[PDB]
Amino acid sequence: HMRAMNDRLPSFCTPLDDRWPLPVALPGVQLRSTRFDPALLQPGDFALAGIQPPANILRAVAKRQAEFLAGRLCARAALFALDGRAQTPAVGEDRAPVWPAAISGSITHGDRWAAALVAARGDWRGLGLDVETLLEAERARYLHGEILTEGERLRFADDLERRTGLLVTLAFSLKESLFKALYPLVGKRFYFEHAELLEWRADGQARLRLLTDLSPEWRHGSELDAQFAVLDGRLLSLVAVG
Ligand SMILES: CC(C)(COP(=O)(O)OP(=O)(O)OC[C@H]1O[C@@H](n2cnc3c(N)ncnc32)[C@H](O)[C@@H]1OP(=O)(O)O)[C@@H](O)C(=O)NCCC(=O)NCCS
């Protein structure tokens, strides 16, 4: 189809990568990712990619424009791959993406790295993806009180002293993914205190526990398995709800 191939990638992004960056694969998901540089962004890249930006992103700063667009390219390519639709999710009033009917996905973008994954809602009701740069030990010791609950600081006291940046970065990433997976289901807003990390292993497997009631099904003590990958000085984590 001739016009859907008029949406070539703007030069500030590397080609959309389909390689799975996580330990365990998930059936029925499509994840695309890119490395971008907000400096290479051109004043006509949005029309080039065929992605209509909302009024907010038109007058935003260059770093935000690049992150939004790069995340929207990955989303459209992931969605195209799953079912063939070159559609971009709108921006909700609650800042969340507005995925098409019977589609659940997630978008993340950090320092020069972006990705998005999508799935049919009949396979995965909720999806939360989040990448975070590895915190330095100092800044991690400064943020450990906000991110880690006192039960987590005790449970992972060893890593808290030895591998400070890894543990805090991870709970940061896992808890943000958990939020992005459950929010389009529960509607409520919960924060770093409302979940705890329970176990994490080098093979990339993790497990979370809810600390408050979010819905009849998502009650206090409900647990969700997650996975994570630590490569390239950044940590990427995934929470998927069947
Ligand atoms: C959504 C949130 C977690 C992302 O913060 P971030 O990880 O620094 O930003 P990321 O780039 O990694 O993810 C950004 C994307 O999240 C998506 N997003 C925003 N709000 C969302 C929501 N309520 N539900 C699902 N996805 C959401 C958006 O698509 C955004 O990309 P866009 O704005 O370019 O479209 C953050 O805005 C937030 O609300 N943090 C507090 C909530 C939290 O941490 N709870 C812990 C629960 S244990």
Residue numbers in the entry: 0 to 241
The article reads:
P. aeruginosa has a unique PPTase, PcpS, which was shown to be essential for the growth of the bacteria. In the course of this study, we also resolved the crystal structure of PcpS in the presence of CoA at 2.40 Å resolution. PcpS crystallizes in space group P1 with four molecules in the asymmetric unit. Thus, the crystal structure confirms that PcpS is a monomeric Sfp-like PPTase (Sfp: surfactin phosphopantetheinyl transferase from Bacillus subtilis). Despite low sequence identity, PcpS shares a high degree of structural conservation with the mycobacterial PPTases. The cofactor in PcpS occupies the same position and configuration as those found for CoA in the PptAb structure with the Ppant arm perfectly visible in electron density. The Lys72 → Val90 substitution induces the loss of a hydrogen bond with CoA, which is more than compensated by the change of Gly76 in PptAb to Arg94 in PcpS. Tight binding of CoA to PcpS is completed by hydrogen bonds between Glu175, probably the PcpS catalytic base, to another oxygen of the β-phosphate and to the nitrogen atom of the β-alanine. Despite several attempts, either by co-crystallization or by soaking, no structure of a complex between PcpS and 8918 could be obtained. Indeed, Arg94 in PcpS, found at the same position as Gly76 in PptAb, a residue that takes part to the CoA-binding site, would cause a steric clash with the diethylphenyl group of the inhibitor.
